[PDB]
Scaffold this motif. Structure first.
Motif, PDB file in Angstrom:
ATOM      1  N   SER A   9      12.948   1.449   7.040  1.00  0.00           N
ATOM      2  CA  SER A   9      12.385   2.261   5.957  1.00  0.00           C
ATOM      3  C   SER A   9      14.182   3.180   5.933  1.00  0.00           C
ATOM      4  O   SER A   9      14.993   3.176   5.066  1.00  0.00           O
ATOM      5  N   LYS A  10      14.875   3.343   7.450  1.00  0.00           N
ATOM      6  CA  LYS A  10      15.745   3.839   7.389  1.00  0.00           C
ATOM      7  C   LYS A  10      17.174   2.277   6.484  1.00  0.00           C
ATOM      8  O   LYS A  10      18.087   2.494   5.996  1.00  0.00           O
ATOM      9  N   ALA A  11      16.488   1.380   6.655  1.00  0.00           N
ATOM     10  CA  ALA A  11      17.176  -0.027   6.558  1.00  0.00           C
ATOM     11  C   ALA A  11      16.482  -0.279   5.099  1.00  0.00           C
ATOM     12  O   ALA A  11      17.276  -1.117   4.571  1.00  0.00           O
ATOM     13  N   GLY A  12      15.426  -0.088   4.364  1.00  0.00           N
ATOM     14  CA  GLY A  12      15.292  -0.729   3.038  1.00  0.00           C
ATOM     15  C   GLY A  12      14.540  -2.091   2.485  1.00  0.00           C
ATOM     16  O   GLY A  12      14.878  -2.482   2.385  1.00  0.00           O
ATOM     17  N   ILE A  13      13.439  -1.504   4.054  1.00  0.00           N
ATOM     18  CA  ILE A  13      12.592  -2.534   3.829  1.00  0.00           C
ATOM     19  C   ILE A  13      11.126  -2.195   2.339  1.00  0.00           C
ATOM     20  O   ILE A  13      10.774  -3.796   2.353  1.00  0.00           O
ATOM     21  N   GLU A  14      11.265  -0.842   2.433  1.00  0.00           N
ATOM     22  CA  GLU A  14      10.164  -0.989   1.325  1.00  0.00           C
ATOM     23  C   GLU A  14       8.984  -1.127   2.191  1.00  0.00           C
ATOM     24  O   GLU A  14       7.251  -1.535   1.806  1.00  0.00           O
ATOM     25  N   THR A  15       8.668  -0.083   3.373  1.00  0.00           N
ATOM     26  CA  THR A  15       7.459  -0.194   3.948  1.00  0.00           C
ATOM     27  C   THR A  15       6.447   1.073   3.443  1.00  0.00           C
ATOM     28  O   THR A  15       6.857   1.337   2.842  1.00  0.00           O
ATOM     29  N   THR A  16       5.365   0.489   4.951  1.00  0.00           N
ATOM     30  CA  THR A  16       4.094   1.400   3.844  1.00  0.00           C
ATOM     31  C   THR A  16       3.250   1.040   5.087  1.00  0.00           C
ATOM     32  O   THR A  16       3.107   0.864   5.837  1.00  0.00           O
ATOM     33  N   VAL A  17       2.779   3.357   5.309  1.00  0.00           N
ATOM     34  CA  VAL A  17       1.909   3.562   6.140  1.00  0.00           C
ATOM     35  C   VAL A  17       0.609   3.751   6.197  1.00  0.00           C
ATOM     36  O   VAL A  17       0.162   4.119   5.357  1.00  0.00           O
ATOM     37  N   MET A  18       0.036   2.852   7.401  1.00  0.00           N
ATOM     38  CA  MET A  18      -1.560   3.705   6.799  1.00  0.00           C
ATOM     39  C   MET A  18      -2.141   3.402   8.458  1.00  0.00           C
ATOM     40  O   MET A  18      -1.258   3.343   9.452  1.00  0.00           O
ATOM     41  N   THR A  19      -3.291   3.376   8.822  1.00  0.00           N
ATOM     42  CA  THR A  19      -4.130   3.640   9.624  1.00  0.00           C
ATOM     43  C   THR A  19      -4.738   2.937  10.543  1.00  0.00           C
ATOM     44  O   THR A  19      -4.295   1.498   9.651  1.00  0.00           O
ATOM     45  N   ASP A  20      -5.009   2.614  11.555  1.00  0.00           N
ATOM     46  CA  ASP A  20      -5.610   1.351  12.116  1.00  0.00           C
ATOM     47  C   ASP A  20      -7.015   0.728  11.445  1.00  0.00           C
ATOM     48  O   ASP A  20      -8.145  -0.165  11.579  1.00  0.00           O
ATOM     49  N   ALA A  21      -7.543   1.877  10.690  1.00  0.00           N
ATOM     50  CA  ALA A  21      -9.139   1.887  10.269  1.00  0.00           C
ATOM     51  C   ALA A  21      -8.997   1.212   8.544  1.00  0.00           C
ATOM     52  O   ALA A  21      -9.584   0.632   8.019  1.00  0.00           O
ATOM     53  N   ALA A  22      -7.677   0.714   8.658  1.00  0.00           N
ATOM     54  CA  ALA A  22      -7.825   0.419   6.607  1.00  0.00           C
ATOM     55  C   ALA A  22      -7.082  -1.237   7.135  1.00  0.00           C
ATOM     56  O   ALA A  22      -6.164  -1.733   5.812  1.00  0.00           O
ATOM     57  N   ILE A  23      -6.667  -1.783   8.557  1.00  0.00           N
ATOM     58  CA  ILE A  23      -6.197  -3.410   8.459  1.00  0.00           C
ATOM     59  C   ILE A  23      -7.309  -4.719   7.382  1.00  0.00           C
ATOM     60  O   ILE A  23      -6.337  -5.133   6.725  1.00  0.00           O
ATOM     61  N   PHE A  24      -8.092  -4.661   7.624  1.00  0.00           N
ATOM     62  CA  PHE A  24      -9.464  -5.432   6.985  1.00  0.00           C
ATOM     63  C   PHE A  24      -9.390  -4.838   5.549  1.00  0.00           C
ATOM     64  O   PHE A  24      -9.809  -5.437   4.556  1.00  0.00           O
ATOM     65  N   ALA A  25      -9.420  -4.307   5.461  1.00  0.00           N
ATOM     66  CA  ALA A  25      -9.361  -3.327   4.205  1.00  0.00           C
ATOM     67  C   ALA A  25      -7.936  -4.258   3.133  1.00  0.00           C
ATOM     68  O   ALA A  25      -8.183  -3.633   2.685  1.00  0.00           O
ATOM     69  N   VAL A  26      -6.553  -3.735   3.662  1.00  0.00           N
ATOM     70  CA  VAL A  26      -5.858  -4.738   3.452  1.00  0.00           C
ATOM     71  C   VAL A  26      -5.377  -5.972   3.515  1.00  0.00           C
ATOM     72  O   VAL A  26      -3.984  -6.605   2.783  1.00  0.00           O
ATOM     73  N   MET A  27      -6.093  -6.124   4.433  1.00  0.00           N
ATOM     74  CA  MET A  27      -5.728  -7.790   4.465  1.00  0.00           C
ATOM     75  C   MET A  27      -5.706  -8.778   3.156  1.00  0.00           C
ATOM     76  O   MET A  27      -5.359  -9.591   3.841  1.00  0.00           O
ATOM     77  N   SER A  28      -6.841  -8.613   2.268  1.00  0.00           N
ATOM     78  CA  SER A  28      -6.418  -9.258   1.375  1.00  0.00           C
ATOM     79  C   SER A  28      -5.599  -9.233   0.292  1.00  0.00           C
ATOM     80  O   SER A  28      -5.364 -10.306  -0.083  1.00  0.00           O
ATOM     81  N   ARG A  29      -4.918  -8.273   1.169  1.00  0.00           N
ATOM     82  CA  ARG A  29      -3.517  -8.553   0.431  1.00  0.00           C
ATOM     83  C   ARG A  29      -2.186  -9.650   1.380  1.00  0.00           C
ATOM     84  O   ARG A  29      -0.815  -8.838   0.977  1.00  0.00           O
ATOM     85  N   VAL A  30      -2.271  -9.613   2.366  1.00  0.00           N
ATOM     86  CA  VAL A  30      -1.592  -9.738   3.503  1.00  0.00           C
ATOM     87  C   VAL A  30      -1.325 -11.156   3.685  1.00  0.00           C
ATOM     88  O   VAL A  30      -2.107 -12.468   3.697  1.00  0.00           O
ATOM     89  N   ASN A  31      -0.027 -11.561   3.408  1.00  0.00           N
ATOM     90  CA  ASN A  31       0.718 -12.914   3.987  1.00  0.00           C
ATOM     91  C   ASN A  31       0.903 -13.808   5.032  1.00  0.00           C
ATOM     92  O   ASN A  31       0.492 -14.398   5.087  1.00  0.00           O
TER      93      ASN A  31
END
Lengths: 357, 318, 357
Positions: free
Chosen positions: B175-197
Motif C-alpha cells: 500500500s506504500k506502492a499503491g496496489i489498492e490492497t485489501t486486508v482480511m483473515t484466513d476465514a474469508a478465503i472461500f468467501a472472497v474466492m468467488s471474485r478472485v481471478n
C-alpha cells in the motif's frame, strides 16, 4: 520513419494494454511509394497481413520466410561492417513494422528466433553472395523439412489413430488438420466430418470446401450446435497455433470451450501442432497476451435492423472479438507431433530435445 | 581451523534456535560463503574425500533445522557441481579448486539476479483491473506485484497467514506502492474466492513431485482455487527446489510454541487442551498450475527435469 | 428523532452498499437520557448489541423477545385507536434503531415477522391488559418451545448419530452445538473435540471453556491447522445462523471454507439449526447481503510492530472482516432440525409445513 497506428474504438478495461486496430485504415498513408525504410517485400507482407488476406498460422510463416528470402536476396554489404551484425540491426524495424501491422503468431516468433540464430552464426571470412546463398539455402531447407515432412509425419501419426466408421469434429481453419483428413480419406478410411464454425471470421467454410472437394461427407454447424452433436461425436480434431510450457493450447478462441464441452460429453479432443510452434513463453489466461480484432466485425445484417451500426455513439457499449485463448492442460489429451504421440506435459521436453539438449 | 569451526558452530546454533537470517536469499548467500570458506581453508587428496566432508558437514545443518531445506539442497547443488567438475577432469589439486571457486562465484552471480529475472518476466502474467490473492509474506511475490503495477492497474487481496500476522507487513509494503490492497483473515478465503481471478503465492520448499510447502493455510487456498478453477502462480526461486519426497521422511511441518494461537493467560483449561501450531502445510502438485522461476515459467509436470538438471540421484539421502 | 450513524473508514468497492460502523462511537450521544422516542429497554438492547456484549445468534433473539416483553408491558392505548395498528406503527422505529445499531440476524427477522403476525391477529373486542397478557404469554410460549424443546430434540437427534470413539470438529461459538456436545458427553459417549477458531472475534474460547468445564477432552487450533487435522477428523459439527431457500448455510465466515476442506478430506459436515432461523430470502454469495465488522479489529500486537495502527493514512489500503457467508448446498450433508434428519433441499419443505401449509 514508421509511425504508430492509432488505436480504434473504446478498448476493454481488461484489454487496455493490448492494441486494437482497424482494417479500414493503413499505416502506409504517410510512407514513400518506393519503399526505402521498409523493404518492399516487407511492406507487401504487412499489407497482406493487415487486410486479412493471409490468415492461416502456417501461411503467415511461409509468406514471412519468402519475404525474408526477398530481403536477404536484396541485401548489400557496407564497407568495414559485418553482415552478422548489420542484418540483425536491420531486420528489427522490419519485424516491428510487421508487428504494428498485425500481432505476430508464435510460429513467426520462432522463425525470427531461428533466423536470428542462423545469421548470428555466419562466419566473418565468408563472402557476401556466398553467405546470401547459405542463408537462402538454410531458409529453404528449414521451410522444406519443418513444413512438409512434419506435416506428413503428423498425418501418418493421425492416420494410425483414426479408425473406420467413426465421426470426427473439427474447428476453425488449419491446413494441417485438413491435410490429415484428406490423406485419411484417400488412403482408405471411411468417415464423416462435423465442422464447427464461429463468428465473425467464419473460417470453417474453407475447410468445408476442402472436405467437399476431397469427397468427404461433411456436416456444418456452429458453437451452440456443438453441444447438440457432441453426444454423437466420438472424436474431435483441433488446430493449434501455439503450445506453451505448461501444456496449454493456444488456438482460435473457440478451442478451450469446445474441449470442455467435449470432456463433458466424454469426447477426446486432438490438437495437431508442429514443433516449431512451441513456446518457452507461458500464460494461463486469454487476458495477458492476446490479439484484438476489429470491433466493427461483430455487426451483422439480420433483416434490416443492424443494431451495432452506430455502436460508438453509446458510451457504455464495448465491442470485443478475441482471437486466441489457452486451454488448461488437463482438458487436452493428444499432442500429435512429428516425433510421435506425446501428451501435453511433453512440450518443454520436445523443446529441450530440439533445442540442442 | 578455529575460526572455521567457530563460524560453523555459530551457523548451526543459529539454525537450531530460530530463523537466522530472515531472508532466504541472504541465508543462501551465507550458505555459499560457508561452503567456499570450508573449501578454501582445508586439505584433501581425492575429490571424494571432500564429498564425504561436505556430506558430514551438511548432515549437522540438516539435523539443526529439518524444515529449512535451503541449506541442504544448496549443499547438494554444490556437491553436484563438484561432481561435474571431477567428471570433466576425469575423462588435480589447484585446478579443481580454482574450478570450484569460479563455479561457486558463478552460482552467486546467478543467485543475485533471481528476483530481478522474476520481476523482468513479471509483465507477461498481469493484466489491468485484475483481482490477485496472496498469502503470507515473501519478497518475491511483493517484488512481482510492485513491478507489475509499474505499467498496469489492478488489485491485490493480501490475505494474512495467521499463526502470527506477518501478511500485514506485506499489505503495508504494497500500500506504500499503491496496489489498492485489501486486508482480511484466513476465514474469508472461500468467501472472497468467488471474485478472485488468479492466485499468486510464494513457497518455502518445492518438493520432488512438484508439491510445495508454504505458509500455512495455502492448501486451503489451493483447494478453493481448484474449486473455482483459477490458475495458481508460484513465484519461487531455484534454490527452494529439493529432492525430498513428501511421505519419504518425517518432520515435514515445523511446529512452534502454541502461545501465538492460545495465550498463556487463558486459565485452567490449558491443562486439558492440546494446541498444535503448524506454520507450514502440504500442497499437492495437482493443485498447482504454474511455477515462476528466474529461467522461465515451468509446469508441476516439469519439476522432475529441473531435479535431474540440478541434482544427482545418489545425493537424495545426503 | 433518531439520526443515522456515520460510516467508518474506507469501504470495499464490492461492499459499498453495506454499512460499516465502529464500536468506539455510539448513536445515543444526541438522545435524551429519559428515553422517550425509543423505549428504554430497546435502547438498552441496542447498547448491548452495538458494544458486542450479546453475540450469539440465539442470545440476540432471547434478549430481543425480553425487550419486546418489556415494551408490551409498558404499552398504553390511546383513545379511538386500535392496538393492532398502533403497536405495528410503533415497533417499526424500534426495530429501525436496533438495525442501525447492528444488522439483524435472520432469527430476529423471523421473530419480528411472527410478532407482527400475532399482534395483527388481536381482536378489537379484547381489552388492554387482557391483550397485553395474551401477547406476553404468546411470547413466553414461543421462546419456551422454540428454544428449549427444539434444542432438546436436535440434541437427541445428534446424540443418536454420534458414536463411540469418534472425533468431532467444531467452529465458532454456538449454544446449540455446545449443548449437543455436553448432553452427548453426560449420557455416555466418549469422544474428544477439535475446536477451530478464527480471527478477530476469537469466539472459540467460549465453547473451549464450555467443553473443558463439561469434562470433554478438547483440542484448540485455527483455520490453517484445520487442513492439518482433518485427515484425522471423522466428523464436523457446525453452527448455522440462517438457512436459505436453496439450502445454503449462513453462519460465521469460516464455514463454507471449512466444509470445502472437509469434503476434500472426505469429512462429513453437520450444521445444527432450529426451524425459526430459516429464510424465504435467498442469496448465493457473501456479497449481496452481509454484516461488516470493525476495520480496527484486524490489527494485533505481534511484538511491538503493529503495522495496521495507522491504516487510514494509506489511501490504497482496505480493511475487511466479514461476518456471514453462504455454503453451496452440495457441500453440507446434515440439516438437523426438531422434525428429524433432513437434507439441505428440505428447508423450504419445512418452511411450507411450518407456515400453515
Amino acid at each position: 520513419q514508421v509511425p504508430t497506428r492509432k488505436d480504434y474504438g473504446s478498448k476493454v478495461s481488461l484489454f487496455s494494454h493490448l492494441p486494437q486496430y482497424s482494417r479500414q485504415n493503413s499505416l502506409t498513408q504517410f510512407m514513400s511509394i518506393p519503399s526505402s525504410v521498409i523493404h518492399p517485400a516487407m511492406v507487401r507482407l504487412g499489407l497482406q497481413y493487415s487486410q486479412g488476406l493471409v490468415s492461416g498460422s502456417n501461411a503467415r510463416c511461409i509468406a514471412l520466410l519468402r519475404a525474408l528470402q526477398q530481403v536477404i536476396q536484396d541485401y548489400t554489404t557496407p564497407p568495414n561492417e559485418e553482415l552478422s551484425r548489420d542484418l540483425v540491426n536491420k531486420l528489427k524495424p522490419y519485424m516491428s513494422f510487421l508487428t504494428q501491422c498485425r500481432p505476430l503468431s508464435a510460429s513467426m516468433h520462432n522463425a525470427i528466433k531461428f533466423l536470428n540464430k542462423e545469421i548470428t552464426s555466419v562466419g566473418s571470412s565468408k563472402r557476401e553472395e556466398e553467405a546470401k546463398s547459405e542463408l537462402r539455402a538454410a531458409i529453404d531447407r528449414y521451410v522444406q523439412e519443418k513444413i512438409v515432412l512434419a506435416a506428413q509425419a503428423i498425418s501418418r501419426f493421425a492416420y494410425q489413430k483414426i479408425s473406420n466408421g467413426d465421426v470426427i469434429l473439427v474447428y476453425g481453419c488449419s491446413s494441417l488438420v485438413s491435410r490429415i483428413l484428406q490423406e485419411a480419406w484417400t488412403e482408405g478410411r471411411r468417415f464423416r466430418v462435423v465442422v464447427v464454425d464461429s463468428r465473425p471470421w467464419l473460417e470453417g467454410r474453407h475447410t468445408l470446401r476442402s472436405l467437399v472437394h476431397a469427397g468427404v461427407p461433411a456436416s456444418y454447424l456452429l458453437i451452440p450446435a456443438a453441444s447438440y452433436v457432441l453426444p454423437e461425436v466420438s472424436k474431435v480434431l483441433l488446430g493449434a497455433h501455439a503450445l506453451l510450457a505448461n501444456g496449454s493450447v493456444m488456438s482460435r478462441v473457440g478451442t478451450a470451450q469446445l474441449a470442455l464441452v467435449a470432456r463433458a460429453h466424454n469426447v477426446p479432443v486432438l490438437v495437431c501442432c508442429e514443433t516449431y510452434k512451441f513456446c518457452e513463453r507461458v500464460q494461463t489466461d486469454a487476458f495477458v497476451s492476446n490479439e484484438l480484432d476489429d470491433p466493427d466485425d461483430l455487426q451483422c445484417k439480420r433483416g434490416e435492423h443492424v443494431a451495432l451500426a452506430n455502436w460508438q455513439n453509446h458510451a457504455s457499449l464495448r465491442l470485443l472479438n478475441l482471437v486466441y485463448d489457452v486451454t488448461p492442460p488437463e482438458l487436452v489429451d493428444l499432442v500429435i507431433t512429428e516425433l510421435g504421440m506425446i501428451p501435453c506435459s511433453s512440450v518443454p521436453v520436445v523443446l529441450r530435445v530440439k533445442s540442442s539438449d | 581451523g578455529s575460526e572455521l569451526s567457530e563460524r560453523i558452530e555459530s551457523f548451526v546454533e543459529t539454525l537450531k534456535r530460530g530463523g537466522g537470517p530472515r531472508s532466504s536469499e541472504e541465508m543462501a548467500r551465507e550458505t555459499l560463503g560457508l561452503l567456499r570458506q570450508i573449501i578454501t581453508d582445508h586439505r584433501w587428496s581425492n575429490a571424494g574425500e571432500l564429498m564425504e566432508l561436505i556430506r558430514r558437514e551438511g548432515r549437522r545443518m540438516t539435523a539443526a533445522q529439518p524444515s529449512e531445506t535451503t541449506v541442504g539442497n544448496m549443499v547438494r547443488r554444490v556437491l553436484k557441481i563438484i561432481r561435474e567438475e571431477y567428471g570433466r577432469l576425469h575423462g588435480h589439486y589447484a585446478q579443481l579448486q580454482s574450478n570450484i571457486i569460479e563455479a561457486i562465484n558463478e552460482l552467486l552471480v546467478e543467485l543475485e539476479g533471481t528476483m530481478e529475472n522474476i520481476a523482468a518476466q513479471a509483465l507477461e502474467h498481469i493484466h489491468s483491473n485484475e483481482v490477485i490473492m496472496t498469502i503470507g509474506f515473501s519478497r518475491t511475490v511483493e517484488a512481482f506485484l510492485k513491478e507489475a503495477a509499474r505499467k498496469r492497474k489492478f488489485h491485490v487481496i493480501v490475505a494474512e497467514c495467521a499463526p502470527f500476522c506477518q501478511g500485514h507487513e506485506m499489505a503495508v509494503n504494497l500500500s506504500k506502492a499503491g496496489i489498492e490492497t485489501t486486508v482480511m483473515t484466513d476465514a474469508a478465503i472461500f468467501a472472497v474466492m468467488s471474485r478472485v481471478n488468479k492466485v499468486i503465492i510464494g513457497t518455502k520448499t518445492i518438493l520432488a513431485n512438484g508439491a510445495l510447502r508454504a505458509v500455512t493455510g495455502t492448501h486451503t487456498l489451493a483447494l478453493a482455487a481448484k474449486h473455482h478453477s483459477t490458475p495458481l502462480i508460484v513465484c519461487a526461486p531455484m534454490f527452494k527446489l529439493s529432492p525430498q519426497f513428501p511421505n519419504e521422511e518425517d518432520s515435514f511441518h515445523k511446529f512452534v510454541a502454541p502461545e501465538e494461537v492460545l495465550p498463556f493467560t487463558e486459565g485452567d483449561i490449558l491443562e486439558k487442551v492440546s494446541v498444535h501450531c503448524p506454520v507450514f502445510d502440504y500442497v499437492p502438485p495437482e493443485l498447482i498450475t504454474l511455477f515462476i522461476s528466474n529461467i522461465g515459467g515451468n509446469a508441476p509436470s516439469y519439476i522432475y527435469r529441473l531435479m535431474s538438471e540440478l541434482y544427482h540421484p545418489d545425493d537424495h539421502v545426503l
